[PDB]
Amino acid sequence: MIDKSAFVHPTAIVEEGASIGANAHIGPFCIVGPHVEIGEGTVLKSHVVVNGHTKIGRDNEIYQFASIGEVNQDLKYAGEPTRVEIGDRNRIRESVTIHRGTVQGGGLTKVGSDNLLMINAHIAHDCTVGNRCILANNATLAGHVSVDDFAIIGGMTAVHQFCIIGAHVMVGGCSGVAQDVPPYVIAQGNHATPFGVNIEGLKRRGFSREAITAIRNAYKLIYRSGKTLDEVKPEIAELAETYPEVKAFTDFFARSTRGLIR
Amino acid sequence: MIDKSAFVHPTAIVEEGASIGANAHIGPFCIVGPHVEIGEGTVLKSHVVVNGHTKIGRDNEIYQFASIGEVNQDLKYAGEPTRVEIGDRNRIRESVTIHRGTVQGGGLTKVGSDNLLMINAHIAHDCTVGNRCILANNATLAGHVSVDDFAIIGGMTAVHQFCIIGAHVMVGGCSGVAQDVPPYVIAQGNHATPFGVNIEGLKRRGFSREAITAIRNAYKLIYRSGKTLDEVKPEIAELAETYPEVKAFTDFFARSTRGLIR
Amino acid sequence: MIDKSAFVHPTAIVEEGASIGANAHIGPFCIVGPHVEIGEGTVLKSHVVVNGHTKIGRDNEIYQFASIGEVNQDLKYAGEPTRVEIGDRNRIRESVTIHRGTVQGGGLTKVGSDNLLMINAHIAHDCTVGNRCILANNATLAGHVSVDDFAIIGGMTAVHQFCIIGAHVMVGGCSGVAQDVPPYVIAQGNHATPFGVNIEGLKRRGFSREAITAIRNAYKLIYRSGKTLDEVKPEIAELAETYPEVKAFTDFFARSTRGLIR
Ligand SMILES: CC(=O)N[C@H]1[C@@H](OP(=O)(O)OP(=O)(O)OC[C@H]2O[C@@H](n3ccc(=O)[nH]c3=O)[C@H](O)[C@@H]2O)O[C@H](CO)[C@@H](O)[C@@H]1O
Ligand SMILES: CC(=O)N[C@H]1[C@@H](OP(=O)(O)OP(=O)(O)OC[C@H]2O[C@@H](n3ccc(=O)[nH]c3=O)[C@H](O)[C@@H]2O)O[C@H](CO)[C@@H](O)[C@@H]1O
Ligand SMILES: CC(=O)N[C@H]1[C@@H](OP(=O)(O)OP(=O)(O)OC[C@H]2O[C@@H](n3ccc(=O)[nH]c3=O)[C@H](O)[C@@H]2O)O[C@H](CO)[C@@H](O)[C@@H]1O
């Protein structure tokens, strides 16, 4: 059901079953599939393709030539009714592609809120993007990739399959990420190696002097101490006792399966 | 002539002379030029541009914002009626570009069958792509490039002009291929260097233990022996006497003009 | 006002206020905003989006899925009426994006004449592209970037923000340009380092033997002499006294703010 306050341009095609919310904009030459849901104030500028079982939140700006909810590029996929979820206030730029998940991997590609997906950023099947993340021009996420909150992926950077980008991380431009990246760190190169802590980002987002200094100690324990991960895991866990921001490390370790970048 | 069982969406524009086959799908906002030929069961999802002298086979899936048969990016080209040929069951993804050839280079850009051209894969003028090849996201083929059967080109990989990618080759992601790549080998880096034989790929495609071991001996002769190519050419030629799979090397050598990656 | 000799395809949408010149082509499914100006003989093939305060010259060929004059990707931008200017005879290929400037940076994105912007070349806010420049497939210009005349930027090359690419420069493929690049030089790698003078380019464009030899002496003064820039600045300035082509260096030095590539 289409709300009586939403604008559907006479040239745009919206299939029956597609529920469009109040004050939404469906621009010219847009295609909205029968299983698609579009929320309040969400704008599809023009030439936008949204299909499949796709749920889209409120106040989103989806630009021209973007393809959302489309069939993924996994050879195993055979046409199963999988899902796509996008949050609120996301700025999805031109030629951006967000694909549906696969049955083998969970059946869901998930995108959070307040993110900026710059021109030709790709989000593959079964990916999970958090909140306020930035993917620059040509940033490619391979299958099953987690991008946690406030993480920034620079231009022409392919994050390899199954890899997890931690919270508040900044992967530099032209990088190749082959393994898991712990929260708060800078990653550059191909393959990507660590280059200290994102000291600027944490200062801008309002982290206290104690927290930033404690995070750097956790970084020193992980990369600079000379011990293995099993030895520094419980030492970080008790450093997190005083500083709740260091808990992001221990939570991340439980999810990490590809190992850390070194 | 359009077959009476093909679907042409009322918003799509098909020029007169364009021959569309039985049970083909021409989605909304698609443009099909007067010299275009589209075969049985071929689907153009939507927003697809097919122009020029372009021959397209059967059961193809061409996705949104793809541009096929278009004028190429060679400065020498002046508008000559050149050709494009695409085989069967090819999955041509979003924003993919396949261009027409040039008079100077043969006048034909050729694509085989059962290939997967992932998002924004570029096929330039006078290129020749074989069967069951895979070009990942942003994989760019420069002019006059041959990609032989079963070859895989990873994400954001530019194969330089005139270069030949052998059969069953796997060029890794973010690579730069400046020279010819012999069949069966793994290529990584920029510029791309060899990293052994694609042992996994050959096992999956059904090569015998003898053949894989013989191919590795041919690799050892080429890269690990310490002799030049002229010395190992006839030694490979008589190794191919027992093992027909090694003939792929000697056939490749006759076509190679840029030299091998080392 | 639309000229009575221009072709506006019945499916294309042109807003009121948009001034289209004589013998211009507005192809099917094109969108032209109310503040857009299109000159004589300019062709928009199809599926082209031109919006914002955008001035476009004569004899341009803008291909399918190109987005010109669009809102930029700067987080500071809030919707200010900024400007885009494109010159004459430019070949703007598929999926190319040229954005509007920002108030903070000057309010203007400027593109010269006779340029070739190959598939998916990005021109960000406040950029300045000169004449007869070439940006290959996936070449990304970040914000506030100057590209001087006859400069060539290869495939998948991100020129970082504020950087200046000198006249007659050739940045190779897959490169990362983090600093200013002096006129006449070859740049390769990531980050990009200098590799001599573009000797071929200068010979093709008609530079005299004396001028090319003098430019190479200026290169030798800058990179090979063993002195700092402040010591070689006035020595170049008096070398330019005899050879007017060396003046391009001293003019460039006044504009350079990020330092030279070394
Ligand atoms: C192209 C493709 O479908 N990729 C998916 C696949 O990747 P995955 O890493 O599993 O790659 P696949 O095994 O699917 O390989 C696909 C093709 O590459 C060949 N091959 C495979 C392995 C090898 O070492 N060498 C080689 O040449 C195979 O013969 C086949 O033709 O599953 C992942 C996990 O579900 C997904 O994230 C990917 O989206
Ligand atoms: C951009 C272009 O048209 N590329 C085509 C050209 O490449 P090719 O390698 O021949 O490049 P071109 O010689 O056409 O060069 C095009 C531009 O680059 C300049 N230049 C050239 C050489 C040099 O060493 N330095 C330099 O600066 C020229 O002045 C010209 O303005 O022919 C190849 C073979 O037919 C094709 O595969 C390419 O698609
Ligand atoms: C993404 C964006 O808007 N980029 C613009 C910004 O870049 P600039 O280099 O200024 O990057 P910003 O400071 O805008 O950073 C944007 C995001 O990155 C985070 N951050 C910033 C700095 C840092 O060292 N680490 C970090 O993580 C910030 O918290 C913010 O969330 O202004 C430039 C100059 O006007 C423009 O050329 C760019 O187009």
PDB file of N, CA, C and O in Angstrom, chain A residues 56-115:
ATOM      1  N   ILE A  56      13.631  -0.732   3.682  1.00  0.00           N
ATOM      2  CA  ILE A  56      14.360   0.537   3.728  1.00  0.00           C
ATOM      3  C   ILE A  56      13.695   1.505   4.711  1.00  0.00           C
ATOM      4  O   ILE A  56      12.480   1.713   4.667  1.00  0.00           O
ATOM      5  N   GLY A  57      14.507   2.089   5.591  1.00  0.00           N
ATOM      6  CA  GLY A  57      14.021   2.982   6.641  1.00  0.00           C
ATOM      7  C   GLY A  57      13.660   4.386   6.188  1.00  0.00           C
ATOM      8  O   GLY A  57      13.211   4.590   5.059  1.00  0.00           O
ATOM      9  N   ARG A  58      13.874   5.354   7.077  1.00  0.00           N
ATOM     10  CA  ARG A  58      13.388   6.722   6.884  1.00  0.00           C
ATOM     11  C   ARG A  58      14.492   7.728   6.553  1.00  0.00           C
ATOM     12  O   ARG A  58      15.646   7.548   6.947  1.00  0.00           O
ATOM     13  N   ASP A  59      14.118   8.777   5.818  1.00  0.00           N
ATOM     14  CA  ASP A  59      14.993   9.921   5.497  1.00  0.00           C
ATOM     15  C   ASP A  59      16.249   9.587   4.682  1.00  0.00           C
ATOM     16  O   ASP A  59      17.237  10.327   4.719  1.00  0.00           O
ATOM     17  N   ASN A  60      16.201   8.485   3.938  1.00  0.00           N
ATOM     18  CA  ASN A  60      17.318   8.077   3.089  1.00  0.00           C
ATOM     19  C   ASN A  60      17.370   8.860   1.782  1.00  0.00           C
ATOM     20  O   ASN A  60      16.334   9.245   1.236  1.00  0.00           O
ATOM     21  N   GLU A  61      18.584   9.095   1.293  1.00  0.00           N
ATOM     22  CA  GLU A  61      18.790   9.723  -0.008  1.00  0.00           C
ATOM     23  C   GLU A  61      19.522   8.762  -0.940  1.00  0.00           C
ATOM     24  O   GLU A  61      20.748   8.625  -0.876  1.00  0.00           O
ATOM     25  N   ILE A  62      18.754   8.086  -1.792  1.00  0.00           N
ATOM     26  CA  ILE A  62      19.307   7.133  -2.751  1.00  0.00           C
ATOM     27  C   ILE A  62      19.400   7.784  -4.128  1.00  0.00           C
ATOM     28  O   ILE A  62      18.384   8.163  -4.719  1.00  0.00           O
ATOM     29  N   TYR A  63      20.627   7.908  -4.626  1.00  0.00           N
ATOM     30  CA  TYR A  63      20.901   8.651  -5.857  1.00  0.00           C
ATOM     31  C   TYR A  63      20.765   7.814  -7.126  1.00  0.00           C
ATOM     32  O   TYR A  63      20.503   6.611  -7.066  1.00  0.00           O
ATOM     33  N   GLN A  64      20.954   8.474  -8.268  1.00  0.00           N
ATOM     34  CA  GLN A  64      20.763   7.873  -9.588  1.00  0.00           C
ATOM     35  C   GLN A  64      21.677   6.679  -9.846  1.00  0.00           C
ATOM     36  O   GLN A  64      22.813   6.641  -9.371  1.00  0.00           O
ATOM     37  N   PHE A  65      21.155   5.713 -10.599  1.00  0.00           N
ATOM     38  CA  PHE A  65      21.901   4.528 -11.055  1.00  0.00           C
ATOM     39  C   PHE A  65      22.336   3.573  -9.936  1.00  0.00           C
ATOM     40  O   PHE A  65      23.150   2.673 -10.158  1.00  0.00           O
ATOM     41  N   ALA A  66      21.772   3.766  -8.746  1.00  0.00           N
ATOM     42  CA  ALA A  66      21.986   2.853  -7.629  1.00  0.00           C
ATOM     43  C   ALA A  66      21.108   1.615  -7.791  1.00  0.00           C
ATOM     44  O   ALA A  66      19.968   1.706  -8.259  1.00  0.00           O
ATOM     45  N   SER A  67      21.650   0.462  -7.407  1.00  0.00           N
ATOM     46  CA  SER A  67      20.935  -0.808  -7.502  1.00  0.00           C
ATOM     47  C   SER A  67      20.906  -1.501  -6.142  1.00  0.00           C
ATOM     48  O   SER A  67      21.920  -2.034  -5.682  1.00  0.00           O
ATOM     49  N   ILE A  68      19.738  -1.487  -5.504  1.00  0.00           N
ATOM     50  CA  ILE A  68      19.589  -1.989  -4.136  1.00  0.00           C
ATOM     51  C   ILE A  68      18.679  -3.216  -4.056  1.00  0.00           C
ATOM     52  O   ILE A  68      17.597  -3.240  -4.644  1.00  0.00           O
ATOM     53  N   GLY A  69      19.136  -4.231  -3.323  1.00  0.00           N
ATOM     54  CA  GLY A  69      18.359  -5.448  -3.088  1.00  0.00           C
ATOM     55  C   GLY A  69      18.490  -6.486  -4.186  1.00  0.00           C
ATOM     56  O   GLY A  69      17.802  -7.512  -4.166  1.00  0.00           O
ATOM     57  N   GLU A  70      19.382  -6.217  -5.135  1.00  0.00           N
ATOM     58  CA  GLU A  70      19.580  -7.059  -6.312  1.00  0.00           C
ATOM     59  C   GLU A  70      20.184  -8.426  -5.977  1.00  0.00           C
ATOM     60  O   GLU A  70      20.802  -8.603  -4.925  1.00  0.00           O
ATOM     61  N   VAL A  71      19.976  -9.383  -6.884  1.00  0.00           N
ATOM     62  CA  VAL A  71      20.617 -10.698  -6.844  1.00  0.00           C
ATOM     63  C   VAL A  71      22.132 -10.546  -6.678  1.00  0.00           C
ATOM     64  O   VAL A  71      22.757  -9.718  -7.344  1.00  0.00           O
ATOM     65  N   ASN A  72      22.707 -11.339  -5.777  1.00  0.00           N
ATOM     66  CA  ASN A  72      24.139 -11.280  -5.481  1.00  0.00           C
ATOM     67  C   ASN A  72      25.003 -12.055  -6.478  1.00  0.00           C
ATOM     68  O   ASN A  72      24.484 -12.723  -7.375  1.00  0.00           O
ATOM     69  N   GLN A  73      26.321 -11.964  -6.305  1.00  0.00           N
ATOM     70  CA  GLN A  73      27.277 -12.529  -7.259  1.00  0.00           C
ATOM     71  C   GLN A  73      27.918 -13.840  -6.792  1.00  0.00           C
ATOM     72  O   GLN A  73      28.971 -14.238  -7.299  1.00  0.00           O
ATOM     73  N   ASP A  74      27.276 -14.507  -5.836  1.00  0.00           N
ATOM     74  CA  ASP A  74      27.720 -15.823  -5.385  1.00  0.00           C
ATOM     75  C   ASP A  74      27.207 -16.885  -6.353  1.00  0.00           C
ATOM     76  O   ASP A  74      26.011 -16.935  -6.655  1.00  0.00           O
ATOM     77  N   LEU A  75      28.121 -17.724  -6.838  1.00  0.00           N
ATOM     78  CA  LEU A  75      27.789 -18.781  -7.800  1.00  0.00           C
ATOM     79  C   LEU A  75      26.863 -19.849  -7.214  1.00  0.00           C
ATOM     80  O   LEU A  75      26.172 -20.554  -7.953  1.00  0.00           O
ATOM     81  N   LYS A  76      26.856 -19.957  -5.886  1.00  0.00           N
ATOM     82  CA  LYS A  76      26.018 -20.922  -5.174  1.00  0.00           C
ATOM     83  C   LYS A  76      24.544 -20.515  -5.157  1.00  0.00           C
ATOM     84  O   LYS A  76      23.660 -21.377  -5.126  1.00  0.00           O
ATOM     85  N   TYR A  77      24.292 -19.206  -5.167  1.00  0.00           N
ATOM     86  CA  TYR A  77      22.933 -18.656  -5.152  1.00  0.00           C
ATOM     87  C   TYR A  77      22.135 -19.105  -6.376  1.00  0.00           C
ATOM     88  O   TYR A  77      22.644 -19.087  -7.499  1.00  0.00           O
ATOM     89  N   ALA A  78      20.886 -19.508  -6.145  1.00  0.00           N
ATOM     90  CA  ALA A  78      20.045 -20.074  -7.200  1.00  0.00           C
ATOM     91  C   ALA A  78      18.676 -19.396  -7.340  1.00  0.00           C
ATOM     92  O   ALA A  78      17.845 -19.828  -8.143  1.00  0.00           O
ATOM     93  N   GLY A  79      18.451 -18.339  -6.562  1.00  0.00           N
ATOM     94  CA  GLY A  79      17.217 -17.558  -6.655  1.00  0.00           C
ATOM     95  C   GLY A  79      16.340 -17.585  -5.414  1.00  0.00           C
ATOM     96  O   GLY A  79      15.138 -17.318  -5.497  1.00  0.00           O
ATOM     97  N   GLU A  80      16.941 -17.896  -4.268  1.00  0.00           N
ATOM     98  CA  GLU A  80      16.216 -17.989  -2.998  1.00  0.00           C
ATOM     99  C   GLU A  80      15.758 -16.619  -2.483  1.00  0.00           C
ATOM    100  O   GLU A  80      16.472 -15.627  -2.650  1.00  0.00           O
ATOM    101  N   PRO A  81      14.566 -16.563  -1.853  1.00  0.00           N
ATOM    102  CA  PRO A  81      14.011 -15.298  -1.356  1.00  0.00           C
ATOM    103  C   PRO A  81      14.736 -14.759  -0.114  1.00  0.00           C
ATOM    104  O   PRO A  81      14.224 -14.856   1.005  1.00  0.00           O
ATOM    105  N   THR A  82      15.919 -14.186  -0.328  1.00  0.00           N
ATOM    106  CA  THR A  82      16.731 -13.628   0.760  1.00  0.00           C
ATOM    107  C   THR A  82      16.411 -12.148   1.016  1.00  0.00           C
ATOM    108  O   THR A  82      15.587 -11.558   0.313  1.00  0.00           O
ATOM    109  N   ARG A  83      17.068 -11.555   2.014  1.00  0.00           N
ATOM    110  CA  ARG A  83      16.653 -10.251   2.541  1.00  0.00           C
ATOM    111  C   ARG A  83      17.726  -9.156   2.571  1.00  0.00           C
ATOM    112  O   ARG A  83      18.923  -9.438   2.647  1.00  0.00           O
ATOM    113  N   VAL A  84      17.263  -7.906   2.504  1.00  0.00           N
ATOM    114  CA  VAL A  84      18.107  -6.714   2.619  1.00  0.00           C
ATOM    115  C   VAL A  84      17.446  -5.725   3.582  1.00  0.00           C
ATOM    116  O   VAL A  84      16.249  -5.445   3.466  1.00  0.00           O
ATOM    117  N   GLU A  85      18.225  -5.204   4.529  1.00  0.00           N
ATOM    118  CA  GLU A  85      17.726  -4.209   5.479  1.00  0.00           C
ATOM    119  C   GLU A  85      18.620  -2.971   5.534  1.00  0.00           C
ATOM    120  O   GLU A  85      19.823  -3.074   5.781  1.00  0.00           O
ATOM    121  N   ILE A  86      18.019  -1.808   5.293  1.00  0.00           N
ATOM    122  CA  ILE A  86      18.720  -0.525   5.368  1.00  0.00           C
ATOM    123  C   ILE A  86      18.044   0.375   6.403  1.00  0.00           C
ATOM    124  O   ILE A  86      16.815   0.486   6.429  1.00  0.00           O
ATOM    125  N   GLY A  87      18.853   1.010   7.247  1.00  0.00           N
ATOM    126  CA  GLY A  87      18.354   1.867   8.323  1.00  0.00           C
ATOM    127  C   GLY A  87      17.913   3.250   7.880  1.00  0.00           C
ATOM    128  O   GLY A  87      17.299   3.408   6.822  1.00  0.00           O
ATOM    129  N   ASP A  88      18.239   4.254   8.692  1.00  0.00           N
ATOM    130  CA  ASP A  88      17.735   5.614   8.496  1.00  0.00           C
ATOM    131  C   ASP A  88      18.811   6.630   8.112  1.00  0.00           C
ATOM    132  O   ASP A  88      19.984   6.470   8.457  1.00  0.00           O
ATOM    133  N   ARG A  89      18.390   7.671   7.389  1.00  0.00           N
ATOM    134  CA  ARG A  89      19.232   8.825   7.021  1.00  0.00           C
ATOM    135  C   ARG A  89      20.515   8.492   6.250  1.00  0.00           C
ATOM    136  O   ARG A  89      21.458   9.289   6.229  1.00  0.00           O
ATOM    137  N   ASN A  90      20.543   7.324   5.614  1.00  0.00           N
ATOM    138  CA  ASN A  90      21.695   6.906   4.820  1.00  0.00           C
ATOM    139  C   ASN A  90      21.764   7.650   3.492  1.00  0.00           C
ATOM    140  O   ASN A  90      20.752   7.809   2.805  1.00  0.00           O
ATOM    141  N   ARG A  91      22.963   8.110   3.147  1.00  0.00           N
ATOM    142  CA  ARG A  91      23.198   8.757   1.861  1.00  0.00           C
ATOM    143  C   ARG A  91      23.873   7.787   0.897  1.00  0.00           C
ATOM    144  O   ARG A  91      25.093   7.597   0.927  1.00  0.00           O
ATOM    145  N   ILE A  92      23.053   7.169   0.052  1.00  0.00           N
ATOM    146  CA  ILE A  92      23.509   6.177  -0.914  1.00  0.00           C
ATOM    147  C   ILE A  92      23.722   6.861  -2.264  1.00  0.00           C
ATOM    148  O   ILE A  92      22.762   7.254  -2.932  1.00  0.00           O
ATOM    149  N   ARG A  93      24.989   7.005  -2.650  1.00  0.00           N
ATOM    150  CA  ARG A  93      25.358   7.782  -3.836  1.00  0.00           C
ATOM    151  C   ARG A  93      25.161   7.037  -5.156  1.00  0.00           C
ATOM    152  O   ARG A  93      24.626   5.925  -5.179  1.00  0.00           O
ATOM    153  N   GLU A  94      25.590   7.670  -6.250  1.00  0.00           N
ATOM    154  CA  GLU A  94      25.419   7.129  -7.600  1.00  0.00           C
ATOM    155  C   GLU A  94      26.118   5.787  -7.798  1.00  0.00           C
ATOM    156  O   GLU A  94      27.176   5.536  -7.215  1.00  0.00           O
ATOM    157  N   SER A  95      25.505   4.933  -8.620  1.00  0.00           N
ATOM    158  CA  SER A  95      26.065   3.633  -9.026  1.00  0.00           C
ATOM    159  C   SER A  95      26.459   2.691  -7.875  1.00  0.00           C
ATOM    160  O   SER A  95      27.263   1.773  -8.064  1.00  0.00           O
ATOM    161  N   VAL A  96      25.883   2.918  -6.697  1.00  0.00           N
ATOM    162  CA  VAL A  96      26.132   2.070  -5.529  1.00  0.00           C
ATOM    163  C   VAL A  96      25.285   0.799  -5.616  1.00  0.00           C
ATOM    164  O   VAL A  96      24.132   0.840  -6.056  1.00  0.00           O
ATOM    165  N   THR A  97      25.870  -0.325  -5.203  1.00  0.00           N
ATOM    166  CA  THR A  97      25.182  -1.614  -5.239  1.00  0.00           C
ATOM    167  C   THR A  97      25.168  -2.308  -3.879  1.00  0.00           C
ATOM    168  O   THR A  97      26.222  -2.591  -3.302  1.00  0.00           O
ATOM    169  N   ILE A  98      23.965  -2.566  -3.373  1.00  0.00           N
ATOM    170  CA  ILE A  98      23.771  -3.340  -2.148  1.00  0.00           C
ATOM    171  C   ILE A  98      22.972  -4.591  -2.502  1.00  0.00           C
ATOM    172  O   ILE A  98      21.828  -4.498  -2.955  1.00  0.00           O
ATOM    173  N   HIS A  99      23.583  -5.757  -2.302  1.00  0.00           N
ATOM    174  CA  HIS A  99      22.987  -7.027  -2.722  1.00  0.00           C
ATOM    175  C   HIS A  99      22.280  -7.790  -1.609  1.00  0.00           C
ATOM    176  O   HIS A  99      22.506  -7.537  -0.428  1.00  0.00           O
ATOM    177  N   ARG A 100      21.424  -8.727  -2.009  1.00  0.00           N
ATOM    178  CA  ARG A 100      20.745  -9.628  -1.079  1.00  0.00           C
ATOM    179  C   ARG A 100      21.697 -10.711  -0.583  1.00  0.00           C
ATOM    180  O   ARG A 100      22.668 -11.049  -1.262  1.00  0.00           O
ATOM    181  N   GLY A 101      21.412 -11.254   0.598  1.00  0.00           N
ATOM    182  CA  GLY A 101      22.236 -12.307   1.189  1.00  0.00           C
ATOM    183  C   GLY A 101      22.073 -13.656   0.511  1.00  0.00           C
ATOM    184  O   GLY A 101      21.403 -13.769  -0.519  1.00  0.00           O
ATOM    185  N   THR A 102      22.706 -14.676   1.085  1.00  0.00           N
ATOM    186  CA  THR A 102      22.578 -16.050   0.597  1.00  0.00           C
ATOM    187  C   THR A 102      22.112 -16.973   1.719  1.00  0.00           C
ATOM    188  O   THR A 102      22.404 -16.727   2.891  1.00  0.00           O
ATOM    189  N   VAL A 103      21.392 -18.032   1.349  1.00  0.00           N
ATOM    190  CA  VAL A 103      20.887 -19.025   2.305  1.00  0.00           C
ATOM    191  C   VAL A 103      22.014 -19.634   3.147  1.00  0.00           C
ATOM    192  O   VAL A 103      21.859 -19.829   4.356  1.00  0.00           O
ATOM    193  N   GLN A 104      23.144 -19.906   2.501  1.00  0.00           N
ATOM    194  CA  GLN A 104      24.312 -20.502   3.153  1.00  0.00           C
ATOM    195  C   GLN A 104      24.935 -19.595   4.221  1.00  0.00           C
ATOM    196  O   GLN A 104      25.522 -20.087   5.188  1.00  0.00           O
ATOM    197  N   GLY A 105      24.796 -18.282   4.046  1.00  0.00           N
ATOM    198  CA  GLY A 105      25.460 -17.307   4.915  1.00  0.00           C
ATOM    199  C   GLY A 105      24.597 -16.555   5.916  1.00  0.00           C
ATOM    200  O   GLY A 105      25.104 -15.699   6.645  1.00  0.00           O
ATOM    201  N   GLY A 106      23.303 -16.862   5.958  1.00  0.00           N
ATOM    202  CA  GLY A 106      22.387 -16.212   6.900  1.00  0.00           C
ATOM    203  C   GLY A 106      21.129 -15.644   6.264  1.00  0.00           C
ATOM    204  O   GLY A 106      20.096 -15.513   6.928  1.00  0.00           O
ATOM    205  N   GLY A 107      21.223 -15.296   4.982  1.00  0.00           N
ATOM    206  CA  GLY A 107      20.076 -14.820   4.208  1.00  0.00           C
ATOM    207  C   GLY A 107      19.755 -13.342   4.347  1.00  0.00           C
ATOM    208  O   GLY A 107      18.664 -12.904   3.971  1.00  0.00           O
ATOM    209  N   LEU A 108      20.704 -12.570   4.874  1.00  0.00           N
ATOM    210  CA  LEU A 108      20.479 -11.150   5.146  1.00  0.00           C
ATOM    211  C   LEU A 108      21.719 -10.284   4.931  1.00  0.00           C
ATOM    212  O   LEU A 108      22.787 -10.564   5.477  1.00  0.00           O
ATOM    213  N   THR A 109      21.559  -9.238   4.123  1.00  0.00           N
ATOM    214  CA  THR A 109      22.547  -8.167   4.026  1.00  0.00           C
ATOM    215  C   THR A 109      21.996  -6.968   4.790  1.00  0.00           C
ATOM    216  O   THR A 109      20.891  -6.495   4.507  1.00  0.00           O
ATOM    217  N   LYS A 110      22.768  -6.481   5.758  1.00  0.00           N
ATOM    218  CA  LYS A 110      22.275  -5.481   6.702  1.00  0.00           C
ATOM    219  C   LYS A 110      23.109  -4.202   6.688  1.00  0.00           C
ATOM    220  O   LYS A 110      24.336  -4.247   6.792  1.00  0.00           O
ATOM    221  N   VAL A 111      22.427  -3.068   6.549  1.00  0.00           N
ATOM    222  CA  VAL A 111      23.061  -1.749   6.581  1.00  0.00           C
ATOM    223  C   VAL A 111      22.398  -0.901   7.667  1.00  0.00           C
ATOM    224  O   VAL A 111      21.169  -0.818   7.735  1.00  0.00           O
ATOM    225  N   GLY A 112      23.219  -0.281   8.513  1.00  0.00           N
ATOM    226  CA  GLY A 112      22.730   0.526   9.629  1.00  0.00           C
ATOM    227  C   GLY A 112      22.215   1.897   9.229  1.00  0.00           C
ATOM    228  O   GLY A 112      21.583   2.053   8.183  1.00  0.00           O
ATOM    229  N   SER A 113      22.500   2.893  10.065  1.00  0.00           N
ATOM    230  CA  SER A 113      21.971   4.244   9.883  1.00  0.00           C
ATOM    231  C   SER A 113      23.063   5.313   9.808  1.00  0.00           C
ATOM    232  O   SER A 113      24.187   5.097  10.265  1.00  0.00           O
ATOM    233  N   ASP A 114      22.711   6.460   9.222  1.00  0.00           N
ATOM    234  CA  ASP A 114      23.592   7.635   9.111  1.00  0.00           C
ATOM    235  C   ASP A 114      24.914   7.383   8.374  1.00  0.00           C
ATOM    236  O   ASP A 114      25.895   8.107   8.572  1.00  0.00           O
ATOM    237  N   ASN A 115      24.926   6.366   7.516  1.00  0.00           N
ATOM    238  CA  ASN A 115      26.107   6.020   6.730  1.00  0.00           C
ATOM    239  C   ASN A 115      26.183   6.811   5.428  1.00  0.00           C
ATOM    240  O   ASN A 115      25.162   7.266   4.905  1.00  0.00           O
TER     241      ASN A 115
END
